[PDB]
A and B are shown apart, each in its own frame.
Chain A
Amino acid sequence: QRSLIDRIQTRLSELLSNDLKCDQFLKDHGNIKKNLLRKHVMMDM
């Protein structure tokens, strides 16, 4: 559970850090944008 909690957060932080990367990730998947990213991360884990 702890590892799961960590993974979601760390990924999110990485996404926040890199803007160009973030858009590409969103495209690959399929404030609002951040929420969508978070949802995608949750789905992954």
Chain B
Amino acid sequence: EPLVLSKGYNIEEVDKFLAAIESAKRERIEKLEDRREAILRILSMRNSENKNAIKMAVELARKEFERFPGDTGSSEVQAACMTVRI
């Protein structure tokens, strides 16, 4: 998917963070947009390694299968984690 990020980031959260930073700076446009674009490019999946994508897939699988929030090691979740790698 098109605006998915690596390194355990989320695009919606990143934009919000950037906005908050901007607000803080103001308290204390084109260029800013360009910087934001550069950041997105850096943190995009499609520029990053396959390893990050796999990790993300594993995390997703865990989220799906976990019989409660903490579960890692549920036989089913372990199997799911194995599957992505396989």
Q: When A and B assemble into the complex, do they touch directly, with CB atoms less than 8 Å apart?
A: no
Chain A interface residues (CB < 8 Å from chain B): none
